[PDB]
Design an enzyme around this catalytic site. Sequence first.
Site, PDB file in Angstrom:
ATOM      1  N   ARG C 141       0.877  -1.152   0.000  1.00 26.17           N
ATOM      2  CA  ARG C 141       0.000   0.000   0.000  1.00 26.17           C
ATOM      3  C   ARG C 141       0.917   1.205   0.000  1.00 26.17           C
ATOM      4  O   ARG C 141       2.086   1.110   0.383  1.00 26.17           O
ATOM      5  CB  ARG C 141      -0.950   0.019   1.197  1.00 26.17           C
ATOM      6  N   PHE C 182       0.344  -1.865  10.630  1.00 21.98           N
ATOM      7  CA  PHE C 182      -1.024  -2.105  10.165  1.00 21.98           C
ATOM      8  C   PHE C 182      -1.005  -2.845   8.841  1.00 21.98           C
ATOM      9  O   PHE C 182      -1.727  -3.833   8.653  1.00 21.98           O
ATOM     10  CB  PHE C 182      -1.792  -0.808   9.935  1.00 21.98           C
ATOM     11  N   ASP C 185      -0.126  -6.201   9.351  1.00 19.93           N
ATOM     12  CA  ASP C 185      -1.293  -6.936   9.825  1.00 19.93           C
ATOM     13  C   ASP C 185      -2.204  -7.315   8.668  1.00 19.93           C
ATOM     14  O   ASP C 185      -2.840  -8.372   8.706  1.00 19.93           O
ATOM     15  CB  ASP C 185      -2.074  -6.122  10.865  1.00 19.93           C
ATOM     16  N   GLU C 186      -2.269  -6.485   7.626  1.00 22.86           N
ATOM     17  CA  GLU C 186      -3.034  -6.844   6.444  1.00 22.86           C
ATOM     18  C   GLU C 186      -2.136  -7.241   5.285  1.00 22.86           C
ATOM     19  O   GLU C 186      -2.547  -7.118   4.128  1.00 22.86           O
ATOM     20  CB  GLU C 186      -3.987  -5.723   6.019  1.00 22.86           C
ATOM     21  N   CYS C 187      -0.895  -7.638   5.579  1.00 23.30           N
ATOM     22  CA  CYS C 187       0.047  -8.252   4.649  1.00 23.30           C
ATOM     23  C   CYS C 187       0.504  -7.306   3.543  1.00 23.30           C
ATOM     24  O   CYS C 187       1.023  -7.774   2.534  1.00 23.30           O
ATOM     25  CB  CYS C 187      -0.501  -9.554   4.047  1.00 23.30           C
TER      26      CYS C 187
END
Lengths: 470, 468, 246, 242
Positions: C141, C182, C185-187
Amino acid sequence: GKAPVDPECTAKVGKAHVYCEGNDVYDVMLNQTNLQFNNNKYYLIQLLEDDAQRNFSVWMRWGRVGKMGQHSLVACSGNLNKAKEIFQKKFLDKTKNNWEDREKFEKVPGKYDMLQMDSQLDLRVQELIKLICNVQAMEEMMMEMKYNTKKAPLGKLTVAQIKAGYQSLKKIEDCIRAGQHGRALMEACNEFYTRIPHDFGLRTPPLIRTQKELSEKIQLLEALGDIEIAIKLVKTELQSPEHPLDQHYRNLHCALRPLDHESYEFKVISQYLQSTHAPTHSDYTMTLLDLFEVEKDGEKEAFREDLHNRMLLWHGSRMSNWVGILSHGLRIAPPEAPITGYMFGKGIYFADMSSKSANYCFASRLKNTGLLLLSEVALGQCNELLEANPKAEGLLQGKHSTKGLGKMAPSSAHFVTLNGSTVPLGPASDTGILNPDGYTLNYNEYIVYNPNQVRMRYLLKVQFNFLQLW
Amino acid sequence: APVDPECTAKVGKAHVYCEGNDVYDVMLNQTNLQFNNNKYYLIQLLEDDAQRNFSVWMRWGRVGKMGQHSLVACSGNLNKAKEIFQKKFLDKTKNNWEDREKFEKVPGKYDMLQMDYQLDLRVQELIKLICNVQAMEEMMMEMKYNTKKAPLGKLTVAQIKAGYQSLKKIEDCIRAGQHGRALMEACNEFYTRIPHDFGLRTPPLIRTQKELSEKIQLLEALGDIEIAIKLVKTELQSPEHPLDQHYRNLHCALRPLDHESYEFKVISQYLQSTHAPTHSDYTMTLLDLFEVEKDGEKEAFREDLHNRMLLWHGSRMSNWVGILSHGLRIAPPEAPITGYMFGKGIYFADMSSKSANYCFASRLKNTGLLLLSEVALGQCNELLEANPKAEGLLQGKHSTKGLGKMAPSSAHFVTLNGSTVPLGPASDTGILNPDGYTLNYNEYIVYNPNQVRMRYLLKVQFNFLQLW
Amino acid sequence: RKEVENHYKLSLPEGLQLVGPYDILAGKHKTGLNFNLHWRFYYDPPEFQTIIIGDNKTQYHMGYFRDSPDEFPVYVGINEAKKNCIIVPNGDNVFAAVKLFLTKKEQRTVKMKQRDKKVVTKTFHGAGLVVPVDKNDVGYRELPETDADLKRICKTIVEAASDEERLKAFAPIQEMMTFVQFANDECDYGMGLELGMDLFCYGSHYFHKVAGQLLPLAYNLLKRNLFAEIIEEHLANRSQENIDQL
Amino acid sequence: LRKEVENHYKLSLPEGLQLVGPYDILAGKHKLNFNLHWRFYYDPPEFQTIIIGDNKTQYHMGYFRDSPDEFPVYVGINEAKKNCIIVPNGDNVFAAVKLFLEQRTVKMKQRDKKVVTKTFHGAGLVVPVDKNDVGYRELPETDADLKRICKTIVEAASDEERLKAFAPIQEMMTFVQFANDECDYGMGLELGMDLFCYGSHYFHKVAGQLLPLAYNLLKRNLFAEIIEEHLANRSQENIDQL
DNA sequence: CAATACATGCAC
DNA sequence: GTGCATGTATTG
DNA sequence: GGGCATCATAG
DNA sequence: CTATGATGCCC
């Protein structure tokens, strides 16, 4: 909300007030943007009458949204009728609407849009409330989301503007669900950026193209709504308060009990704390300073105790927002807010590893005090999920909760019990779930839908302990 | 030091800041006919009288049209104000502010400019007519907001001289018959130095002599305004009648004459006999006749020269006070020679009504003044057609006459104090033109001021007639 | 070949001095010797395996660039380690690299054009990050901060006059690390890849552990443990003199 | 029989409707102010109306001569009940009637090359000037502000406000006198033409003080006589046969 | 116009 | 050679 | 006829 | 951005 005078009229911010008359207050803010041909502009107008002298004036200010701009002070020597006419004329010039029906506003294309704006206690409980209910820190957080993180360029917005934001995001969700990159998508983004203020500097405002970017917008918009409810909650109270945080606690109205280290509960939760610190969150450890018992009224009968698969699950969140939660509990994704932004659908989100949800606490090296919540959630029959899917809600067919299946998680053989709840004690271990079609999640997560299927029970005071820095 | 009214919140509460020579007030003008720019920018540092707070006032727009302004107050941070001021000045000029005296404009930037920011009832009647300061301001506003020729305000004599310099360059340019690029830059230089408002339209090229000449008349009106407002300055020291000090400023004896005297009769008869027939929309009545005694001219007058005649001169109501203080003035060397059809000097007629047209009498204001002066033509040069190069054409001659078709004939001429009075009626003089037009009426132009001796001033009711 | 590439633990494709593997080819390796540090300069990332040293004043150098320890070199990169952090491509083979220098005293091929098509963000070195990408784009991201403002953050951190002022300026980086976890946590590992790489690139020691908290872990998350070894030992030894025989 | 027509007219003629004017002598219906014969309220002496149409708009066509000593330069049409504008409509009576049922020749385009100013009727002025262009100078004011001056004078509620508002016209007359002194007669020609175009009686004498004199200066005494008699008799009934 | 920001040659 | 300001373009 | 709304331009 | 206007299109 309350109507302050914009400080930009420095020669008149202190000797004059914005004029009001019932419903119609002669103050308005307009925003316009056109990414196709690069319009990005604001326009605030405030009618100011002096407190001392009988003289009316219109103040106008303009520029790029975010970048403070040129202003004008038009005095009338008390000829309010002409000044109001000027006000209305400028309004129609920019809007094509009559001013008096500002309530029944209808924006017209190729013109500006409007927007709508706004001591007997335990020392530990005092530290907790002062942590969550301090008006200064909330002010600092709002200032951080305007000039530190340029998220709210003009200022704040209303709850209904937030709802309109959610509505427009829903339209964007529909738009992107059709994946076509033509004109209507650009105008919808214009609709978004007009209702929701951004600051893009020189470059053309980018197309919001993926669901991830949508989700960032979602986090922003929910954060804004959280700001609104947080600042609404910290409203002061009269009738002999002597310590405003106690009326803030009355506003919370939630039984919160301090726990001793010598209790079985403290020992087992500290064991749980240590066992469920994920090793890939190794920039810090976590220490239990305190554990607070949570009793939110009405949930007891409302809790779905009937459902099996009852586990104690984490929920971490920033230092500031707990004041809303402690007054109101956790909420699911707003109906207006698009469902497709949330990778496992809407609802309320909980973790089974303390450190992952604990990441959402936003603790710092200077500010080492954070809170973790544990909630008892009766999952019932879980739907097992390999991959992110916002359509998780439809796949239930009678079911009541979903588990998103991660590679690593504690094993059911290692589980303990607390007060008739099954406690999934750690450490995390391999879960043997694999995907020959897509990826596999690193760690399990649990998603619930009915808020009444959750019963917050203890609040964890967590000192997030970071380490050496170079 | 006047305060700009545009800063309404501080026009009564503040005064413009200055420091000795360097006064922190400035007006800048820019124009570019190629890119159709006509813009001003005035900046003024204002400090409040009561509290110590400095401010810069800026205003910009089309010259003439009052414009967009900005007020930056500083609460006594004079250094901040000076920095901001000089910063804006350099931003608009690329010149340092402190040496405002040694200014040099640069292309693609604004140019600076410089601003100013016991007697008988009949003779008292005359001075009150010419020294009416209210009426002078009325003339000033009439040449700033009625005739938008000098819109923003006044100028200094040296700025006017710079105007003359630019007029000289424009004259040389047009004398070279080239209407090209250098002409555009010179015209831009002109219109920057001299404030105009052309509204939307592109400022036009000055293409003939006529536009030059009207600018000259404008500039003469400007210089008259400068010298007039300087001269009509009232004085203290217990005068009890300020017009008497205005009369001192005239320093010119003006005596009332009786209607029954021979000379008054012949001058009134002279007024009537030389009434041009094509100016019959009005007549002229001799109300009274004033004796003129201008100091220093008697020793200066060229009595030695023959061909002495009594000649008319009319001019607007306002400048008489300057003339009675200074006499008429000859065309300035700086000013282009070619604007005056027979060259420079002083202008007189032998036609009462033709000269009398220049007085600007009105239907409501039926009263005018005419001056008669004795001018010795000497050997006068006869001129059929306009030629500004007449000054070279003297070679021993002393004055020029422009030869009109209709004029009085010498048989009817009378005498006043041993001076020849060219009495009328007008008749043909039998001169004709085999190449072009023929002048309607004669005119006399002198170069030496010493060949002029003002004799009498005529109080004349210009009497207009039926209006519909 | 095989002993050389056993020594470097990497697969190698088939007035200047040839170094790195050439040291062994020259037999100069014959003198405890950790070849994970062999010719790694002060600013050489683990992806960049230096093979030639030039002008020592500017520390201009050329090297194999492998995006992952299990893959081939994706290019030959060049950098002037005494001057800046920019890695400039230098051809697709040793022939291209030496002619680029020779002409200077194909650089980006079609496969490299595919790599640039896979470049998601340039990350202060201009070469770009590559993350494996699914249909829901999990793996990366974007950072919430632009490159210039990130450079501004690093600037204001390094110029702070005290450690308390430094840590105070560290706060957006701490929150950026929070969002990085974060993403973890969502890869979305490529975000922490970008942040850690930038902290490496800035060169001030104050970022060594935190990037060392993130970037090895991320490479642990990326299953690129050789790079984790390289960055740990490199943060212990990112030197201005980098010959393994000293 | 054209000779007696033109002796009555003192002008030279080139070689559901009713024909009027000089054809009336061709019709012999004259069996009398022929300087004013069929001269409408807004017909200048330069314009001699020869055809009448709809009396509702007072549409009419006429020969237009720039000077009484020449042939007409064109034939114009005007609606006296509508405006003061004279519209070019052909080069002869036949072209004009065909248009109502060439508008501009090469000769008229040359006249347009000599056209100095429109003067509210749009047809243009041609004035002879010398090699130094003396014969013409511009007014210091534009046409639209003059129209505003005329409107403000005619809308004045009293004699004093009219006399005060007349001041730009008075001084424009003063500058017209100056131009006349310097032989730039066309300025006064334009001023008289525009005040004639406005049509208010308040200018009828003063234009009559300047514009005939200018024609006297232009040696166009016949048109001066026409405008004298017209200003004396500019009626809404103008057929001398009644 | 103000006011920004960004490519660029110039004084300690 | 390095701050550093300037000149140009855009938007407002 | 009068008035305000696209285009335009300059400030 | 103001601001002012040509112009034009409309009750």
